Design a protein around this ligand. Structure first.
Ligand SMILES: *[C@@H]1O[C@H](CO)[C@@H](O)[C@H](O)[C@H]1NC(C)=O
Lengths: 48, 50
């Protein structure tokens, strides 16, 4: 069972993590049923 | 979810992933109606000593 908990927070700090409290609400409970041991996030390039 | 209690209109605002609410004794004291999405308090029926 793949649980997605999410929270969006308006911040204005430049570099590091903000110091504060914000609870993450559950968004999507996803029925995959597969083995996960390694992950990788996706970025986007800018071309000019 | 079965039970017996007085149903009143509730001021609690449930998050959309929430269906019911539990008290200290884990009895459902607030519930969302599954047809019209509104919250109801469930006060128990009166108990007395005769
Ligand atoms: C039917 O149930 C849905 C929730 O699943 C609700 O949004 C809708 O208003 C209901 N319609 C009627 C006619 O009760």
């Amino acid at each position: 069972y793949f649980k997605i908990y999410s929270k969006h927070t308006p911040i204005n700090l430049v570099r590091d993590l903000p110091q504060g409290f914000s609870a993450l609400e559950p968004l999507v409970d996803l029925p995959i049923g597969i083995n996960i041991t390694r992950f990788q996030t996706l970025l986007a390039l800018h071309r000019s | 979810l079965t039970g017996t209690g007085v149903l009143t209109e509730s001021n609690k605002k449930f998050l959309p992933f929430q269906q019911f609410g539990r008290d200290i004794a884990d009895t459902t004291d607030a519930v969302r109606d599954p047809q019209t999405l509104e919250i109801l308090d469930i006060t128990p029926c009166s108990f007395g000593g005769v």
